[PDB]
């Protein structure tokens, strides 16, 4: 029932839940932007992220598992299901400016979620979490 979590090389993070399986990446590429993509302020807004119930379910589980407050925390983003470029959701985890408080909350949630969270978001640096579908790695449990 509980989604499976995996860390390979102490830097590559994965999550699997039923038919859904994601790689979790952290870097300075802002793939999604509120000007172009779907703004997520309520769990139900995620119906626009995918046609797949399993991809929606796993995304909501992950966000709940890291302690995201759907109404009071900053909204996050996903690519509209009508686009063909691929399923993706993006959370701003930048430890800077107005986002610092939320970035610390996210870091805590990740440390509780993952056994050894290898935190790559540097203090004062733009750092965005992107979750994308991937085949469950062969070396994972």
């Amino acid at each position, epitope marked *: 029932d509980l989604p499976l979590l995996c860390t390979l090389n102490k830097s590559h993070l994965y999550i699997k839940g039923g038919n859904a399986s994601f790689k979790i990446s952290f870097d300075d*590429i802002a*793939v999604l932007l509120p000007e*172009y993509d779907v703004i997520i302020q309520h769990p139900a807004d995620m119906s626009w992220c995918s046609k797949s119930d399993d991809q929606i379910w796993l995304s909501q589980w992950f966000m709940n598992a890291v302690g995201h407050d759907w109404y009071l925390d900053p909204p996050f983003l996903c690519r509209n299901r009508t*686009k*063909t*470029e691929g399923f993706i959701f993006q959370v701003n985890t*930048s430890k800077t400016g107005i986002n610092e408080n939320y970035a610390k909350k996210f870091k805590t949630g990740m440390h509780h979620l993952y056994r050894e969270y290898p935190d790559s978001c540097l203090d004062g*640096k*733009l750092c965005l979490m992107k979750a*994308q579908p991937t085949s469950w790695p062969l070396q994972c449990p």
Partner: antibody, heavy 124, light 108 residues
């Protein structure tokens, strides 16, 4: 080998339109956004916009909205840029370049390959 | 939109000298900055990506570095073939933005 081949020099009258092409070879066309960049004589590079060939999604620089129309044909691995209502300010060299669709941290997201450029000259 | 403010449009240099070209991003872009070299009538060539990584076949003398929103391209020892235009670019997010460019010329 990766190659981006652009169409030849354009000569056009003021107020007309031209459609520039950039044919991609040696890679998966649908794994990249095709970028377009303008370079006016003796000046710098100015990013115009990009097109995703999967569904034709676009990104533009605010200045070029209403000037440039970006399309792509997946079957011919070709991206197109139509420049409308041509004026003297449109006379320039236009380059296409590729940028990978995002898929984790371990790819280069800068413009690694570029076309040879296409010259557009506007005159009556 | 993020804007890249490049240093001087023209720089006078001598062969064998250390040259520094700078670029300032209007907001934090992490390390998502590239440097391109262009010679007249040729396409730009990618030199540096991720602010400090040399692209394929780029010689050791091209050194990219970063400090917050300040990015620097250093040519440790300028060779005759390095006289060209240089452009910084941010690629963290659309719209992509280029610096205005810097042309290295020879002092005499």
């Amino acid at each position: 080998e990766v190659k981006l081949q652009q169409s030849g020099a354009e000569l056009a009258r003021p107020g007309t339109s031209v459609k520039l092409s950039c044919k991609a070879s040696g890679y998966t066309f649908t794994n990249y956004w095709m970028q377009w960049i303008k370079q006016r004589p003796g000046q710098g590079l100015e990013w115009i916009g990009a097109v995703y060939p999967g569904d034709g999604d676009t990104r533009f620089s605010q200045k070029f909205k209403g000037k440039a129309t970006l399309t792509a044909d997946k079957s011919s691995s070709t991206a197109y840029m139509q420049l409308s209502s041509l004026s003297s300010e449109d006379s320039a060299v236009y380059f296409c370049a590729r940028r990978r669709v995002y898929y984790g941290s371990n790819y280069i997201y800068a413009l690694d390959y570029w076309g040879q450029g296409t010259s557009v000259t506007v005159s009556a | 939109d993020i804007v890249m403010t490049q240093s001087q449009k023209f720089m006078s240099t001598s062969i064998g000298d250390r040259v520094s070209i700078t670029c300032k991003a209007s907001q934090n872009v992490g390390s998502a900055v590239a440097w391109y070299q262009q010679k007249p009538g040729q396409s730009p060539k990618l030199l540096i990506y991720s602010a400090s990584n040399r692209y394929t076949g780029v010689p050791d003398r091209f050194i990219g570095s970063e400090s917050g929103t300040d990015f620097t391209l250093t040519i440790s020892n300028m060779q005759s073939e390095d006289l060209a235009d240089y452009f910084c670019q941010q690629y963290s997010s659309y719209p992509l933005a280029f610096g205005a460019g810097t042309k290295l010329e020879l002092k005499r």
